[model samples]
Target: HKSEIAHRFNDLGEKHFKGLVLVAFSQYLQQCPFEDHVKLVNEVTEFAKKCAANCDKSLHTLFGDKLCTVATLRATYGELADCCEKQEPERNECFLTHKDDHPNLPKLKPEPDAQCAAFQEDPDKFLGKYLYEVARRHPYFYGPELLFHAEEYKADFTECCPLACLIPKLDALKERILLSSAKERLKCSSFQNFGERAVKAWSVARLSQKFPKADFAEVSKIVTDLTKVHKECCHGDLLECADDRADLAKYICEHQDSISGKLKACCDKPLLQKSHCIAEVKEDDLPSDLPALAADFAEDKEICKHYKDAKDVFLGTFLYEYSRRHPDYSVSLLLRIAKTYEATLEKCCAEADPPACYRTVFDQFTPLVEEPKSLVKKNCDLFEEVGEYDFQNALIVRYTKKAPQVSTPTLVEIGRTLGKVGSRCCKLPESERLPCSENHLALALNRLCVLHEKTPVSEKITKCCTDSLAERRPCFSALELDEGYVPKEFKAETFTFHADICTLPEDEKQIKKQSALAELVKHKPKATKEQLKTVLGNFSAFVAKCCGAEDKEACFAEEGPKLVASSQLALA
Candidate 1:
């Protein structure tokens, strides 16, 4: 039973490491061997030491030997603290409480020593030392370079370098310096100055390596200062500064090669020392090397020939003349030419070297296209009136809205203009007279009817003449038919000229009254006034017609003459 019990307890010990406990251990520690376990204790003191050693080894392996550097150590500790606080609250609280207790923790000093015996003895001391080392290094450890005096170092270099070197140095040191120094001084330099300094330094350094005599120590010092300044001001951001500096150096190297090539190409050409110096090789006094000279001239002529076909020479000549006349055109024209050359080369030369042809063409044509197009548009507008017929036709063709049929207003205008023309036909000379034909009359009537249909009949009919009796008769007959006027169809006497005439305005009221009396004359055509009186013996009928009264007594009894006269008024 003792051996079996020892085996069970040994199994429980392994279970404890995996965060579990067996029934044998629980029962052994309780009243029933599973209760009253207050006196029991399981110590992790030894396991804790092994875990701490494992953690330190893991960190060192992962972060390399630079793990103690300020940036690397701070990051590691920050991550560890966050992870521990989340997973183990009791351990986190203990660590935080003793985190800053420096010498009390093992390995917490800048260099660990064996004098920290208490920490070496205690398992928890390893963790304490780890946390303390991280916290202590957080304030001063910069990076792998251990650039402790970053700001002072940058300033020292900047002060020694020239203005050109100072700019790049300032950029390089922008982020590595003390925060106060970076914020105050390094932020004001331009990118162009920095670029120039970097290129000059790189060129000098690289060429110095190839040609020992070109060591340029002064320039190298300038470059070193620039790089240090950038690293300091940028807060140890050496990679960004290095990349920019490298690019600038490459550009300078290429440019130097290009300049050398140009100089070599032009070196053999004869130069005139003075304005009045004459060429020794004229048309007749040529040397034995005349063929070579002619070959060179031929090459230049061929280049110019290629340019002529692709470029607008007329415009180029015009711009050249303009530049010679205007003092301010030099810079603007040169810049325009450069931009045009770049664009032309990109378009025309897919694989050509140097792209000299494209450049020549662009230089020839750029000035002509750069002027504003609005000036041309304005000139066209100003000259358009000289050929008004074309302008009118263009307007009518382009601007008029499409319509299925002619409108009433258009018909009216046509009719009015035609009528005025027609009325003057008799007065016109024989050669000029345009007699109204059947077609003309039909057209005029059709257009007039269209206008008339759009207007009210009263207004349309009022336009006709009423004064000519002969014209009035036929005109009224045509107007009535045109207006669709229909006579009343009821129990009333047929309308006659006498009745119609009575409706017209009269010179006196009695004359109009007599006209109304003539209506009964048709009934007794041959009778005298006596016969008319006898026929009018039915005076009540006459009275009703004259005064709107039912009987003669009512008509005669009316007090006012105006009422009587109004009643006698004829109806049209």
Candidate 2:
């Protein structure tokens, strides 16, 4: 039946559109409760009958007109309507491959109590919408796996999880997605840059770190063929990649006795599922055998001789070797460590004291390793102490002080994005929390690279964006305030609070408070930090008094002017 369906669709035009459509259909069906599955299946089958009858039509037009007529499919995938406008194979391919590319799509965060309330109100519809959202965004993932993910989601939070419990789960989910994508991209990049050995070494090292308890000999046996799969596949040759992946799967399945015990679980799966399992399988905790510190440069310092011969190759080899030995570190961290090593060599190789400078190279690496952890701890501790709401408010106030020339609203937006890093990451388990916060904080600041493009650029921000991820956070922290900034004339309304502020929920009310204070400080950039604090304190006091009072309007009418007058004086 599958082959017949495939042949029918292939006859219509492209070879693989049928597979993509089937996957989409499966994705839609993943959300249906068991009782509804039969009716939905019949509905989907009837729709497919219509599709095959209209096989002469273009795929996009066919799907748009007939395929969309199916209620369940339309409900699940209507957001992807734009992709249906493209011509054959491309249209289908777009449906399968497109990512959620909305440039200004805000960061993912835990659903608040409000969303939990909505979930409780209509569990099935809430889950359907959730699955739909995830399905469209990650159209490339396997159907059964996505179905399993939904099952797990249903199992985990049937009663609606608490915010404290919810935060870490969201963080861990994000990290899982991030780590998978990052490793894949790094694999492809390594292959493109330094060829097969680079990718192989990194791959083996990555596995060593992930499955530290895996027998090294067995891992080596399987990885040789697995590397072949990546070599042929990670480039633009999906056909070849598929073939090689199949071969690796077949070999592992047939020779199970020769492979690691880890490979057996993956082998128990069938076809593409088996291949995916093997590709993703891991063993145990980090290998404890690797040295506590990174390997120091050889004591003989023949490194400079290798450096003099061919720089890029030498550096690539250093990354390759370092990666093989220390799978525990990230590629970005390795890039940073390598860059630092290179810089130290540049300075030392030119000097009469080259040996002396080289001797200190090991010491230089200590800070690079420690700083990322320290930065993570610093951000997490702050977020924990203050909680998300007050933490975000503090962030807005802090950045506003640092870059007074930037608009308060714009800084507010950036601060809100940065705040997500804390809410999503700081609650993770202690082991995962550091890396989770470190990588995400770097990504959060990436917005700074583009947020101010229309205005006079902070080239410092630009340079930081261009710099390696390892160094970018430090660059952001060290940036000086925007220079030569002229203050705008202050408006009285800027200090005035509206009664509508009382109607705002707690989080939004805090935003208004921070925005008001940030606006005031921007106008009075010369004001001392203590002066700004007093001004904020005054605004908060009045809002607290009037918002809670019986005659709120009368209180605001009476107190608003007094609040503004005092703020003006404090700012002055």
Candidate 3:
């Protein structure tokens, strides 16, 4: 049966000699007619003999050289005799009778020292002899077919004692072959084929334990030429092969205790030197590690690459935990988790919404403040003042929504608080406190003008403050100040407080509404009418509730309208 034929080949390919016999027997019975059955059996038996013969030949060619060195040819042939007898119908009975009479193949001998001298003198002759012996003796007829088994031979060559003996001689011969090919490839004008030949030759040299010798300069020249050809003809397809070579080089470096260690150490120096040269080029400047990272990003781009971000997300949550546990981790030690997250995000975030992407980063950053309090405190110190009044002023700057109301005593308090913080380096020194350069200041003033233009009564005050001639002018002249630089008849309104409910301290709710109002106005720009109205209404309610103003309507009428008109006049 065709199935049996396929099965026989598959078993042979797998080196399962005993299994092939069983399969052959099972399928031979399926054929019809008694005479036809005999013919089929004979044919199947012949095919099985060929398969076994190939396996036996491969075992002998691969192991024969060292077999005689370890034991006499007579003993080696005894094992072959046993393997051969198992195929016969009488099996072990025939083997027991005839094993001692089996003819011994010629024992392998070490080549004469003179033979190596002659070969070294004339490499062409040596190569011719080598190829001729292989062609005549090896059952595998083609270069690729020989190479395929050569790979299989290499994989387990160290463990196979018989092959180990011939390996040194084989390697010496292989060096000559590779050197000849590499030299030929180097001289060829068309490197299109030369590069491919170099790669194939290098692969064979590596498998056969032949080390290629070249200086960094020479190897770099070859790599540069190969890269050019690759660019012109291969369109970057050759880069994958180059990458594979780099991978093999890295593997060789890792396993320095193996036989590959010596050969790789010798050959890889030039390859790595060439790699460093290639790395300096703009296109290749990205670290060798990046290609791996880019590949990971290709798989998942939503990942965080930064340590701070990774510490926030579940996927990278363990990274921070590990870092904390291993506090002695060196700065140079790579954070693979962060790198992977970075790679993932770079790969996947192209189509993601900008706001959503930013939100992810923001979420990661927000937690960092709590986790690394010292760092966050240091950052906030740049903007905050030390003392209570200055601290309140800083909070007002960051959190408030209304401009300062400047009556005579209020003006005195504002100057005193500003001087204290400024003297302490919380604000820039008076020498450095130049006129505001920020665009927001101008934008706020413009908005204030628009608000005033929409209102009627406060137009005169807004015009005066905004006039070029009145630049940096005081809100009130000294002549308007009565005694002790205070306006004696000026009525002071109660102030109101508003705090961020989420962040407020548990204590300190009972200040004069005045200080609370001062805090609310600290960061405020000269206000617009709408802003003042909102501030006044909220503040008046708080003042009434805190101060226990029985005539709430009277308090609201005086303070609320006055605060709104003050901001409107400032805008005007």
Extract clashing residue pairs from model 3.
297-343, 300-344, 301-344, 301-345, 305-342, 397-523, 462-572, 463-572
Instruction: Evaluate model 2: give its lDDT.
Output: 0.58
Candidate 1 per-residue lDDT over residues 201-320, each given as its tens digit: 332322222222211333344345444534432332222233333343333334433222222222333221110011111111111221232222122434344444644332232222
lDDT for model 1: 0.29
**Model 3: ten consecutive residues of lowest lDDT:** 431-440
Q: Say which candidate scores most in TM-score.
A: 2
Tens-digit per-residue lDDT, 78-110, candidate 2: 645555556665655454333321223234556
- Prediction 1 TM-score vs. true: 0.15
Candidate 2 Cα outliers beyond 4 Å, as residue runs = 1-288, 291-296, 300-332, 344-360, 370-388, 401-410, 417-434, 447-458, 526-530
lDDT of 3 at 483: 18
TM-score for candidate 2: 0.58
lDDT of 1 at 118: 38
lDDT by residue for model 3 (248-324), tens: 44444454333222343344455534333232221111112212322222233344444235533332332322222
Instruction: Tell me the lDDT of candidate 3.
Output: 0.32
lDDT of 3 at 96: 25
Error of 1 at 191 (Å): 12
